[PDB]
Subunit: 246 residues, 4 copies
């Protein structure tokens, strides 16, 4: 369970780094199972018994429950290997626009979060379990826009419209910031946060596993391009992201 200083930090920043959650032994168990699984590794829980158990470990479920406060369902669980020269352009943000064909909307209810009577209510959160140190920007560090999880104005739509071609992750931004982590730390993430990763320059592999959680009525995570015509299309339609003009 999260302390009050942790809930406070989560609420105000949109994420929480929890240091030293998993032992060196466990991390190596996790690392081994990833190397055997040979870019992204979809559905880790169906492919391993150790990842099916990780997805329900109390070291992940207890902080998750404290920020979702709904009946839970496991929405996704993947592995991630990043090599030299990989990058993750910004996505998320609370007020980014989306065109529907007859209107543009400014809310994505899959990430719209609230607070009520001592409890945070976030619909979609991730637990990033790092399996390798990342201690400098060139290691491909997590980066985020400060406060962007409670943002009221869109940011990217005007960038794209004025013909930008450079991701903030490369060029910088007054409120872009990095997070540095050690093996077996967990990064608890509010998906409303606008975030990405620095371009990795270093040699070696960066590895992590990620589990996404939500209310029991959210469909399992899968990308959808748009509402289908028979209104039967399920999935998550993305709003403005840097990959749409960078």
């Amino acid at each position: 369970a999260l302390t009050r200083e942790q809930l406070y930090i989560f609420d105000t920043t949109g994420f929480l780094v929890i240091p030293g959650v998993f032992g060196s032994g466990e991390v190596e168990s996790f690392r081994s199972e990833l190397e055997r699984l040979d870019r992204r590794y979809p559905d880790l829980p169906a492919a391993s018994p150790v990842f099916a158990r990780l997805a329900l470990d109390d070291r992940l479920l207890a902080p998750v429950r404290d920020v979702v406060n709904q009946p839970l369902r496991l929405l996704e669980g993947y592995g991630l290997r990043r090599t030299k020269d990989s990058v993750l352009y910004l996505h998320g943000g609370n007020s980014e626009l989306l065109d529907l064909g007859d209107r543009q909307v400014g809310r994505d209810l899959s990430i719209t979060h609230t607070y009520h009577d001592g409890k945070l209510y976030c619909p979609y959160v991730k637990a990033l379990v790092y399996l390798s140190d990342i201690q400098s920007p060139e290691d491909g560090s997590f980066c985020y826009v400060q406060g962007s999880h409670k943002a009221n104005f869109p940011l990217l739509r005007e960038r794209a419209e004025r013909g930008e071609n450079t991701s903030l992750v490369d060029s910088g931004f007054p409120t872009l910031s990095d997070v540095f982590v050690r093996s077996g730390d967990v990064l608890l993430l509010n998906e409303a946060l606008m975030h990405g990763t620095r371009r990795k320059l270093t040699e070696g592999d960066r590895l992590l596993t990620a589990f996404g959680y939500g209310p029991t009525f959210f469909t399992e995570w899968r990308e959808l391009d748009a509402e289908t015509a028979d209104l039967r299309g399920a999935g998550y339609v993305d709003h403005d992201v840097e990959e749409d003009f960078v």
Copy 2:
């Protein structure tokens, strides 16, 4: 077929909207006829998958234009059913923005399936319902739709304290200061934000109460399915409801 400023004001401030005379007499009759084809007090589950008639109605623009104006998300059809009500049927109160749920280790007072917001000129309601009325309902004994005023934006819970004080009567049978009724004509559509606390009066008159209902929400909501509590393996999908009158009446 879109909603006026005044219609949006009313949906926003009351949690619902009667759109009158949407379907003509002929359509209403073909609808009832189709229900008669599918055949006391009884239910017609999953209408869109059992009838091409009702599969068309689900995607009719007279239902979709209003819905799109209050959901404003990539849309999905979550549910669709038929209802035939006779004498001595009642629907007790359910819904309400702030009703409590015991999760086991805690107590929560939000339900994110009905938690709605507003931003830059648009309403964002994640679960709305289109009721298509195939019968006139013109008095409370006909089993009229009833609701608690403003309950779609209530910050306090109502039902827990009544359950605890040992009440066993529904406000539907008993009355409440801000409990109001809604009267409709057949062919009227009632647009409904599911955050509203609502039910219907006990029906004591003769004849058949007939309606169809369709639920819409975002494409990342699952098709409607009742779920008692979170499944033991966090795989189960569905909707866990909060305090409803059925729980202690």
Copy 3:
């Protein structure tokens, strides 16, 4: 102090009628004090009379007001109101009504912008109406209000004014406009974000009441102000769209 059911009702409807807070004895006592001071408005009652100065601090008023403001408190206004036949009060208030502010148009009035947090309501401006006579039909000039309008997100009145209307909704009617009936010595606790008014009084006699407004200690005492002054030194409350603006 308000009950959970009373807090629920106030939060969900924007007001609360608390029945029979003052007995017939106090009521006539209050009524007589209004005479001694002789639509007519009796401004600054607490300065004009020790009786109303006492009323304004009466725990029967302050306990329910504290339950809806929940700030360090300040008396912001106190007046009396005498109404007679053919008097009417058109709609004012409304959470999202517009105000033209020189170079922009705004749709929030922070003097009535209210919130909820951790079990408590926080309304910055509430009125306690003490009724000194019964009102049991619309033609008596009953309190009327637009349901849910204290938490409205769209403006109502501007569309009407631009569409060129000139009849008030208290006369013409409106789908969600309702009336409230009260008895002598009732208190009506009102959230000023609520859009309200009164029906036109067609009956004979006098409709008497006293109103005390309350707010945080950093609100100025109530005063109308046409607009921001050029030296930024003018204090007071600038009205958003009201029906009197075009009826």
Copy 4:
């Protein structure tokens, strides 16, 4: 002189805004010189025509109007001179508690802000005009708790009850950041933000002027201890601040 979309984003997401080089070095010498004619310098406009003009200068009013969006009133205007070993402990914060006699409240309406149809509505903002350079924490830099202008949990009360003695501007806090400014820069501040300054360890005076603005129905700024028995007390009652227990 109105705020760009990016400046509005930053102010919304962080709770403040540094506006660089608003006043030239001639103007800044004019202000420093005037402050020599007259440590806190209370009510500057009433005391000096130069600062009466500055209080209504459009380089301040234009951005202020963009984040308040109400009929505007000037609520305070003071000057500030700090020397060595001066410090300013944390205060502000969206959810800091206040004991009200028979109850405990967690909103302060004088700084409770909102957003509606494209506009920010912040009832109390300060415009800080810096007359000297602050480029290191030991000059006594402005500091703030990130995202605390939208915080939903209290932070200080629990610290106070645990019995903490030292301030966060001394020990540090994981989300406490610093802001460096140059002479002639304007800091535009949402007062819901929890903020203060580092202890000044250098010589030379630290000069700035501050003007505070709100809606016309706000009383001019004065400190008030509690609501008075006659409910006639006007002014601003502060919630938990660090000075209460440090």
